[PDB]
């Protein structure tokens, strides 16, 4: 593990040179990465969610758990906390464990891209990267590609503005450009 | 908010402890210290005091908030209660679950005679 | 129609007013929900799952200003 | 537009006129119309006033209406006995008292506001009075 150690020394610890604070403890931090994988056309049975979560847990270090629904989804018979997908939310060391597998070894299904925008916005500085699939990691034999399954990513941080979060964006090796 | 979450874990217990009354024992946690006080049935007096801010014991600690220091305070509350003739006490878990430093104090005090 | 029915009684009863009781029991009201307007606080007790307060005491009722969660409550009289 | 909406009840008590009002002076504008009399003021009576006052200020300023109807008039069917529930709606109406201000203007000269509010001294169940902000 090297990328979280880079976050402990090389990221925002000199930010007082560019951003105004009353304490050096105000510099921005990463809180969580929620994640999402959609059940798609299996929504009306969804007993496969345990078997889909188990293969997200093949690139994540977390133990699988199943997403409960909110406000229902369409007319598919979704009621209260009905199990409907997977998040398997990342905190602490597990966030950068994943960002040392993502587009380092998990590569053979990526799309044509070269750099995501740094001047992007939400109002707090919480960045996102479009990937659509779990993009596959290579094994000694596979025999693993049939549908690959989905992936969505948006970070959550202590930042109060989009240019404060632009200094925290330094926390990753993913292609972002100024 | 943890100050607010603590009173959500405590109000229901206080709302049955008020139906017992009598001479009562309360505990105060914090992460760097621990304290306890015995309060009178009139609501106007304090009968026994002990803590890890007490100069006699603070010098004996490797850490002023430690579980062993909570048991050491518990054994002192029961000692002082015995010399002051205090019995049949009502215990308050003071917003904390009965396995942490709150129990380490109150159980050690009860095995030192202070029922509860 | 034309409005229909409009049911009988809708019974609701009120006892917790002035120096009520003084013999063996003091009372609140029958209003389907009650926890602070005519309720007990401190060492006083008299209410269960039915939300009608009936406290078992020879103390008369007493009224006083405020109590826990800024609710009004009712108290007992010493003699 | 000049009618109660997002309500849960459709019919109201016929009512008596006892309200004293606090709509007793021009609120945002400079010139207006005061009731200076008592009774019922209908949607029809204010339509007749709107049609009239518009002829003095044909292309001149915005006009504001300070009165609003809160009560519908209900009347029973003709070929039916007493009882069987409250009657069917006809028109919307407001109760009025002498102190109440009904209309406001601002984007015109004071002698053109008078030209419109003197024209309103007609077609109404009260003998209205023209009023203005003044200095005090």
């Amino acid at each position: 593990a090297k990328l979280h150690d880079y976050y402990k020394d090389e990221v925002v610890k000199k930010l007082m040179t560019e951003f105004n604070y009353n304490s050096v403890m105000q510099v921005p931090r990463v809180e969580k990465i929620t994640l999402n994988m959609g059940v798609g056309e299996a929504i009306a049975d969804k007993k496969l969610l345990d078997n889909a979560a188990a293969d997200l847990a093949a690139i994540s270090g977390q133990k699988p758990l199943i997403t409960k629904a909110r406000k229902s989804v369409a007319g598919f018979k979704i009621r209260q906390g009905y199990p409907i997908g997977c998040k398997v939310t990342l905190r602490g060391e597990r966030m950068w464990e994943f960002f040392e597998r993502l587009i380092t070894i998990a590569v053979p299904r990526i799309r044509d891209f070269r750099g995501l925008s740094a001047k992007s916005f939400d109002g707090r500085g919480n960045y996102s990267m479009g990937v659509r699939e779990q993009i596959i990691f290579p094994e000694i034999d596979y025999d693993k590609v049939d549908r690959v399954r989905g992936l969505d990513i948006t970070i959550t941080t202590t930042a109060k503005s989009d240019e404060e979060g632009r200094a925290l964006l330094a926390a990753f090796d993913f292609p972002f450009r100024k | 908010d943890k100050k607010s979450a603590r009173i959500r874990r405590a109000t229901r217990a206080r709302r049955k402890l008020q139906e017992l009354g009598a001479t009562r024992l309360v505990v105060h946690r914090t992460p760097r210290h621990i304290y306890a006080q015995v309060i009178a049935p009139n609501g106007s007096e304090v009968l026994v005091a002990a803590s890890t801010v007490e100069k006699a014991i603070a010098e004996q600690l490797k850490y002023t908030g430690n579980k062993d220091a909570a048991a050491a305070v518990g054994k002192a509350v029961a000692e002082r209660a015995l010399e002051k003739g205090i019995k049949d006490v009502s215990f308050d878990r003071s917003g904390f679950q009965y396995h942490g430093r709150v129990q380490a104090l109150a159980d050690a005090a009860r095995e030192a005679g202070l029922q509860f | 129609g034309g409005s229909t029915r409009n049911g009988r009684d809708s019974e609701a009863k009120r006892l917790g007013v002035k120096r009520f009781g003084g013999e063996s029991v003091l009372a609140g009201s029958i209003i389907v929900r009650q926890r602070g307007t005519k309720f007990h606080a401190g060492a006083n007790v008299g209410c269960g799952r039915d939300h009608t307060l009936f406290a078992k005491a020879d103390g008369k009722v007493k009224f006083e200003v405020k109590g826990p969660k800024n609710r009004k409550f009712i108290s007992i009289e010493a003699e | 537009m000049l009618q109660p909406k997002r309500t849960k009840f459709r019919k109201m008590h016929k009512g008596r006129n006892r309200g004293l009002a606090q709509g007793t002076d021009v609120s945002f504008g400079s010139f207006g119309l005061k009731a200076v009399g008592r009774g019922r003021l209908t949607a029809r009576q204010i339509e007749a006033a709107r049609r009239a006052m518009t002829r003095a200020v044909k292309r001149q300023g915005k006009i504001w209406i300070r009165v609003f109807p809160d009560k519908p008039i209900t009347e029973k069917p003709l070929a039916v006995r007493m009882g069987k529930g409250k009657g069917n709606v006809e028109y919307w109406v407001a109760l009025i008292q002498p102190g109440k201000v009904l209309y406001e203007m601002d984007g015109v000269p004071e002698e053109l506001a008078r030209e419109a509010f003197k024209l309103a001294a007609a077609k109404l169940p009260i003998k209205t009075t023209f009023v203005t902000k003044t200095v005090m």
Binding site: - | - | - | L20, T24, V36, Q97, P98, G99, K100, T134, V135, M136
Partner: protein
């Protein structure tokens, strides 16, 4: 500066106020300035024709109250829904 004469009243309420307004005066008060409130009667039209010129709310007034001078400021005035010659009036000490 708008010298008006103020006599002190030891009557109060609806019956007295109606009996006052039926004459040449209407009810008024003076308060503030670390001194008690004072209930007075004032001229029912002189004050209306003065305050209508608005500088009454821009200047310190030369009132004569219980025979004597104190200087006062116009604070607030109470109007009647349809009777133009005032309902009640407030002053504060200067």
């Amino acid at each position: 500066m708008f010298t008006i004469n103020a006599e002190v009243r030891k009557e109060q309420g609806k019956g007295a106020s109606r009996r006052l307004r039926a004459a040449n005066k209407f009810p008024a008060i003076i308060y503030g300035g670390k001194e008690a409130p004072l209930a007075i009667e004032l001229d029912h039209d002189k004050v209306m024709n003065m305050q209508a010129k608005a500088e009454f709310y821009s200047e310190v007034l030369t009132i004569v109250v219980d025979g004597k001078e104190i200087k006062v400021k116009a604070q607030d005035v109470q109007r009647h829904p349809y009777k133009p010659k005032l309902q009640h009036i407030d002053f504060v000490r200067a």
